[PDB]
A paper describes a structure:
In addition, complexes formed by chicken CNTN3(FN1–FN3) and APP(E1) also proved recalcitrant to crystallization. To resolve this issue, we designed a fusion protein of CNTN3 and APP, speculating that it might yield suitable crystals. We thus fused chicken CNTN3 to APP by inserting a GGGSGGGS linker between the C terminus of the FN2 repeat of CNTN3 and the N terminus of the E1 domain of chicken APP. This chimeric protein crystallized readily, and we refined the structure of the CNTN3–APP fusion to 2.75 Å (Rwork/Rfree = 0.197/0.231). Overall, the binding sites identified in the structures of the CNTN5–APP complex and the CNTN3–APP fusion protein are similar to the one identified in CNTN4–APP structure. Residue H137 in APP contacts Y681 in CNTN3 (Y853 in CNTN5), and its side chain forms a hydrogen bond with the carboxylate group of E686 (D858 in CNTN5). H137 also packs against V652 in CNTN3, as is observed at the CNTN4–APP interface. In the CNTN3–APP structure, we observed a hydrogen bond between the hydroxyl group of Y681, which hydrogen bonds with E139. At the CNTN3–APP interface, residue T651 forms a hydrogen bond with S124. This contact is identical to the T751–S124 hydrogen bond observed in the CNTN4–APP complex.
Residue numbers in the entry:
A (entry chain A): 496 to 699, 1030 to 1190
B (entry chain B): 496 to 699, 1030 to 1102, 1108 to 1190
The structure:
């Protein structure tokens, strides 16, 4: 008769690639067990599959082995099947479900393409990497694009693994202009490769508010690019970040405002007015305007000139302010003896609250 | 306006996955061409599709590029499209039809499985590989199976690409026994990969005739597995391969006999009668039934399976036994077992499958 099912299949010493499996000989049927075979089942493999062991062949005197060539960051089950001179026997009950350790991703997106859209846009699309190839939590993409002939890259960090496209809207885009495009990958453990550079064609003044207490709030008229006073005569400076969100939606009623964030650079604004447009003087005031973020959050596009590097960081256990992530980006470039050239927020966790930062470091003169 | 169609499209340096394309600029319609795109059409692609180049960026002053990631042994047509500030231009006239060079097949059969059958049988199935993925002429399969837990493979060569099935029939098969199965691919350019190993459970006396001149012909009774005399009691030994075929059919009126082949080893048969009703060692003739099924060969450790198909050769069983035996001797090994491939006539074949093992 064939051997009975082995018992107590346990997993120890689990890594990103390997696993140590141990078991106990089941009820053999009057013929000594001559070989052991290991099988594994994951949410991605269709049923039970054979796995490669070291040593390659397991005999009856052996009760532990190393399974190799596994996929990092995958939930695994294991079972053992014993063999006789008669033949293969009943498989063992599965082991406890275990997840291999994380690793840097190795597969860049396939089918990097794009095109279309409305005027002054660049639509970049790609195939989303499935879960079985992300190799760890915090999987994201890095989209890079630049016009033909130029050296400086334009890059942005896309933190959602399911996002299949990025749209770049800026008046620097020419009608049906060719761009070199490449999409990379990363996770918590580090950065992965980029896809090959391919060609994507283009298609064929930002909402801000500025405040100075004692004066009527100012806002950016998106049509003429000029700073304008409060449409009403009463709205002075605002205390809370939620109130800044309300004022953004009040001044831009035809926009879907979902968040706010401080601008990275101050601006000098003359012609502030008091309540009721009384005592309008010409005294300038340097303030930091709040950007009224529209619709679903999209990371900023950063310029990465030659010899500069693009860095980014995100911490799911931290919900911090714009000033916090600026200090993070500024200090990080200092540790490498470089200057901070451009940065943006990642992963909003609240009104003007974020869990990460993207930034560019550059050398000095 | 958009650019005009490029001219002077030429395709050179054709490999199995590579082709060098070059072209000439048309009229830019007073707006300079800023990019070029290469497109291809095949019997399998849905119309014209963009193809990858190296580099995959082609500016307006480049007039040659290297197309990559092509499918080996496929007819390709190429065309070039220019672009400018207005948009994509008129596509060029397509180039001449060219076929990529052959290469080993890369895609093993998916959906390998099996199960069922009669007693002492192991049924193995898989999804056949379409012509698009065969990468050359002479595409075929290698079916390997072994009892679960063992290491030594039993392999057979399947020459027809459209064949999705192989039944292994042997007394050593136990009822409803687990087996490890994998199916591989190959073509005239070489061997391809094997599929993932899958478990296939088995299910819940070969027809042949032997002759000895001066005595009545004998034949194997499939029910009891014993050699029996000529039922008619008149037929003596036969001198033609075609006449042996008719006697196989006469002995088995209920089976579709399509070919005959010499058995690889002799047998010992007793109870020889004369016309009208002492052992003798003779080489029996196998009565092949139905479509041709290649023999199952054992491939022990350190031994290699080799198969050869000559579409310009139609030879006999002895000729392929010699080819197999000389092929191993050239490899400093011995011929262990063999079987015929590709019938081209009555007891005539176009190839052989065999195993070479070390002298030890």
């Amino acid at each position: 008769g064939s051997p009975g099912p082995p018992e107590h299949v346990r997993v120890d010493e689990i890594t990103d690639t390997t696993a140590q499996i141990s078991w106990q000989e089941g009820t053999d049927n009057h013929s000594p067990v001559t070989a052991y075979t290991i099988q594994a089942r994951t949410p991605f493999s269709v049923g039970w599959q054979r796995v490669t062991t070291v040593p390659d062949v397991i005999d009856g005197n052996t009760f532990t082995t190393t399974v190799v060539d596994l996929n990092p960051w995958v939930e695994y089950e294991f079972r053992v099947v014993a063999s006789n001179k008669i033949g293969g026997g009943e498989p063992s009950l599965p082991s406890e479900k275990v997840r291999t350790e994380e690793a840097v991703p190795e597969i860049p997106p396939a089918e990097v393409s794009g095109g279309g859209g409305s005027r002054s846009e660049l639509v970049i699309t790609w195939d989303p990497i499935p879960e079985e190839l992300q190799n760890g939590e915090g999987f994201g993409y890095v989209v890079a694009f630049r016009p033909f002939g130029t050296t400086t890259w334009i890059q942005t960090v896309v933190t959602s693994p399911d996002t299949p496209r990025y749209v770049f809207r800026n008046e620097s885009i020419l009608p049906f202009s060719p761009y070199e495009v490449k999409v990379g990958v990363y996770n918590n453990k580090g950065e992965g490769p980029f896809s090959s550079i391919t060609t994507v064609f283009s298609a064929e003044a930002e909402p801000q508010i500025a405040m100075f207490c004692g004066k009527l709030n100012m806002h950016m008229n998106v049509q003429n690019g000029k700073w304008e006073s409060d449409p009403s005569g009463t709205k002075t400076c605002i205390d809370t970040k939620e109130g800044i969100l309300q004022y953004c939606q009040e001044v831009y009623p035809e926009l879907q405002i979902t968040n706010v964030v401080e601008a990275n650079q101050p601006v000098t604004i003359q012609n502030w007015c008091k309540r009721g447009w009384k005592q309008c003087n010409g005294h300038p005031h340097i303030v930091v305007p709040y950007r009224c973020l529209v619709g679903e959050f999209v990371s900023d596009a950063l310029l990465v000139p030659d010899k500069c590097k693009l860095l980014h960081q995100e911490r799911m256990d931290v919900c911090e302010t714009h000033l916090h992530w600026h200090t993070v980006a500024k200090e990080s470039c200092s540790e490498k003896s470089m200057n901070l050239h451009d940065y943006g927020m990642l992963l909003p966790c609240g009104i003007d609250k974020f869990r990460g930062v993207e930034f560019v470091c550059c050398p000095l003169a």
